[PDB]
Amino acid sequence: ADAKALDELRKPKFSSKYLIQHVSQKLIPAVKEWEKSYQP
Amino acid sequence: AVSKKEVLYFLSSKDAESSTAVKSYLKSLYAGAQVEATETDASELIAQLEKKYLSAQVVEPGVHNIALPLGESGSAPVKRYAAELFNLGAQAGFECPFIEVSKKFGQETATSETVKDVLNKTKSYVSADYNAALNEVLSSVEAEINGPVLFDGKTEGFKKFAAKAKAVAVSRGLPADTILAYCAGSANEDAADKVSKEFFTWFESAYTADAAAEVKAIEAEAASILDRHLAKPVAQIRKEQASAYASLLKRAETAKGAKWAEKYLEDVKAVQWFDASVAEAPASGPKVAA
Amino acid sequence: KAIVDALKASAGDLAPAQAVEAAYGLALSGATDAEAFKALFGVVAPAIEKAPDALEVSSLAQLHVASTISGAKLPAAVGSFVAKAFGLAADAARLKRSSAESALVADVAAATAVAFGAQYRPEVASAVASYVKTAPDGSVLDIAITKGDAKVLVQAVPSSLLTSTTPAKPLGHVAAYSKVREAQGYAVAVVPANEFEALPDQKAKAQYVLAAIKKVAPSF
Amino acid sequence: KEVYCTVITAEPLDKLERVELTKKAEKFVDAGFKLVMQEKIDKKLLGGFVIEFSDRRVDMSTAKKVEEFNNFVNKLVLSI
């Protein structure tokens, strides 16, 4: 409860980092399969 | 958990919520777990795209831990701020900014054969009053050639352009002869360090003046945001900022099960812990376990 | 050996991060006094068991270099964990590659493909993709060749791992990486880029790499 | 029983770079027709080949791949 930590309190809070991660978890498997199925 | 390509980007990184992901992974390898094989796959397009989206998970918390030097006097808080962004980009895997934008020029214009095409495929990365100032020099040199200047160097018409393209660069304020003699090297290291110590006084005057120009825009944005806000009545401000706090909690509370939104509401509950911990002992601050 | 005389006696005056850098720089310089390495690892290895996460992974990789070159063994839970952490810190230095080390590895992998016989452009590009076998610790080796049971590894060291003076010999950190890869079953032929990119043509660059492999492992 | 065609590449071809090229181009004609060739150089292409059959064109260049890659990535992140 109270008196949390230091390494829990050192993180910047409302940074993105998990929109970038959520895009990177939905862009990378969806573009790894695009390059293995590609003919012009 | 991590997919091991995150945890390799977070090894030399220094921020908090990544190093507690590394310390939790380094404790798991110590407890008899085997390390995943690093995939030697996903050829050049997917490999350089994962670097784009893994370095931005190192840059994005790192930018938020760098205090801006707003309203400060001196050049040392700007040389602190810029050096914190140098050391942040190095933790995210970037090289020197001189090395990284020169890589961006040769990547955009590997197949530019004319100097008017290299001035229009590297248009986004050059200052526009410098890119235009190289178009009066390209149009002046085009008069004595009356043929398109090629991106050769051995062509005499390129040396007629580079006789006057260098004439702008010194007039812009940047010593082009100390830049060009740095990246060419020298024979003896004694006179290679006379050009190294004159490149790095340009470069330190280069990275400061655009870290300072990035600060003076935030100083002028915050002063125009505040002076737009001091003109309001206090009741308008209290309900304008209560709707924006409500609509942005609501955007993170509709998205349920998503990783970013459940981490968003753990930050709201940790902001409220900071206000509740200061409210218990306000001359000491928040309570840390120590 | 006045320096290693102080290190076997005063290794309680060191933090565990300072004793790793003490043992590593001895093993890089060829120190055989294993009673010093018993002293230096007696600071580190008790600290790793109570906190495995207290040392940074770049210093755990410096310990696996120090415990394999000098050969002084570690505790059974530590010495395998420090062996796993060499696979991490060599992979993280591969992901964050300098793009002159990327352009040199792909230049050496081209010059080691034409050395092994590849007369055409579509023959090298399927060969350099076959050299990227994975290490026994999970790492990635860029140029790994196998003939039966004999393995050679080719190492390229650009300028960042070269000494900044005029003879320009590589630093001790690359013999660190080679002597760990040799203890996994490889023969490391170092290719320094002050010498490799001094060559004028690609076939001369193949005459540099093939001379480098046969002076290390003559079976290839 | 021929097909007149033109291959535009970024570099002049090898003896094996040609032999692998026809075998992939042989399934773009609907027969066992011998596409004869024509050879051209265009360094504006970033390697690969583009084959123009004088009624249709197949662009298997990389400089069309790395722009059709970006058009798919920039379309996909505008959803995510």
Side-chain angles (χ1 to χ4, degrees), chain B residues 112-115 149-159:
Chain B
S112 74
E113 65 272 19
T114 56
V115 186
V149 195
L150 273 72
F151 205 42
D152 183 28
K154 303 163 241 163
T155 291
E156 193 272 334
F158 189 83
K159 290 181 286 293

Coordinates of all heavy atoms in Angstrom, one line a residue, chain B residues 112-115 149-159:
Chain B
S112 N 19.9 8.9 -56.8 CA 19.8 10.2 -57.4 C 21.0 10.5 -58.2 O 22.1 10.5 -57.7 CB 19.7 11.2 -56.3 OG 20.9 11.5 -55.7
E113 N 20.8 10.7 -59.5 CA 21.9 11.0 -60.4 C 22.1 12.4 -60.6 O 23.2 12.8 -61.0 CB 21.7 10.2 -61.7 CG 20.5 10.7 -62.6 CD 19.2 10.0 -62.2 OE1 19.1 9.4 -61.1 OE2 18.2 10.0 -63.0
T114 N 21.1 13.3 -60.4 CA 21.2 14.7 -60.6 C 21.1 15.4 -59.3 O 20.5 15.0 -58.3 CB 20.1 15.2 -61.5 OG1 18.8 14.8 -61.0 CG2 20.2 14.6 -62.9
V115 N 21.8 16.6 -59.2 CA 21.9 17.4 -58.0 C 20.5 18.0 -57.7 O 20.2 18.4 -56.6 CB 23.0 18.4 -58.1 CG1 23.3 19.1 -56.9 CG2 24.3 17.7 -58.6
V149 N 23.1 19.2 -63.8 CA 24.2 18.9 -63.0 C 24.1 17.5 -62.5 O 23.0 17.1 -61.9 CB 24.5 19.9 -61.9 CG1 25.9 19.7 -61.4 CG2 24.3 21.3 -62.4
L150 N 25.1 16.6 -62.7 CA 25.0 15.2 -62.3 C 25.7 15.1 -60.9 O 26.6 15.8 -60.5 CB 25.6 14.3 -63.3 CG 24.7 13.7 -64.4 CD1 24.4 14.7 -65.4 CD2 25.4 12.5 -65.0
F151 N 25.3 14.1 -60.2 CA 25.8 13.8 -58.8 C 27.0 12.8 -58.9 O 26.9 11.7 -58.6 CB 24.6 13.2 -58.0 CG 24.8 13.4 -56.5 CD1 25.2 14.6 -56.0 CD2 24.5 12.4 -55.6 CE1 25.4 14.8 -54.7 CE2 24.6 12.6 -54.3 CZ 25.1 13.8 -53.8
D152 N 28.1 13.4 -59.5 CA 29.3 12.6 -59.8 C 30.5 13.0 -59.0 O 31.1 12.2 -58.3 CB 29.6 12.8 -61.3 CG 30.8 12.0 -61.7 OD1 31.1 10.9 -61.1 OD2 31.5 12.4 -62.7
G153 N 30.8 14.3 -58.9 CA 32.0 14.7 -58.3 C 33.2 14.8 -59.2 O 34.0 15.7 -59.2
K154 N 33.4 13.8 -60.1 CA 34.3 13.9 -61.1 C 33.9 14.7 -62.3 O 34.7 15.2 -63.1 CB 34.7 12.5 -61.7 CG 35.2 11.5 -60.6 CD 35.1 10.1 -61.0 CE 34.2 9.3 -60.1 NZ 33.8 8.0 -60.8
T155 N 32.6 15.0 -62.4 CA 32.1 15.9 -63.4 C 32.5 17.4 -63.0 O 32.5 17.7 -61.8 CB 30.5 15.9 -63.4 OG1 30.1 14.6 -64.0 CG2 29.9 17.0 -64.2
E156 N 33.0 18.1 -64.0 CA 33.4 19.5 -63.8 C 32.3 20.4 -63.4 O 32.5 21.3 -62.6 CB 34.1 20.0 -65.1 CG 34.9 21.3 -64.9 CD 34.0 22.5 -65.1 OE1 33.0 22.4 -65.8 OE2 34.4 23.6 -64.6
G157 N 31.1 20.1 -63.9 CA 29.9 20.9 -63.6 C 29.5 20.7 -62.1 O 28.9 21.7 -61.5
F158 N 29.8 19.6 -61.5 CA 29.5 19.4 -60.1 C 30.5 20.2 -59.3 O 30.2 20.7 -58.2 CB 29.6 17.9 -59.7 CG 29.2 17.7 -58.3 CD1 27.8 17.5 -58.0 CD2 30.1 17.5 -57.3 CE1 27.4 17.2 -56.7 CE2 29.7 17.3 -56.0 CZ 28.4 17.1 -55.7
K159 N 31.8 20.4 -59.8 CA 32.7 21.2 -59.1 C 32.4 22.7 -59.3 O 32.9 23.5 -58.5 CB 34.1 20.9 -59.6 CG 34.6 19.5 -59.1 CD 36.0 19.3 -59.6 CE 36.0 19.0 -61.1 NZ 35.4 17.7 -61.4

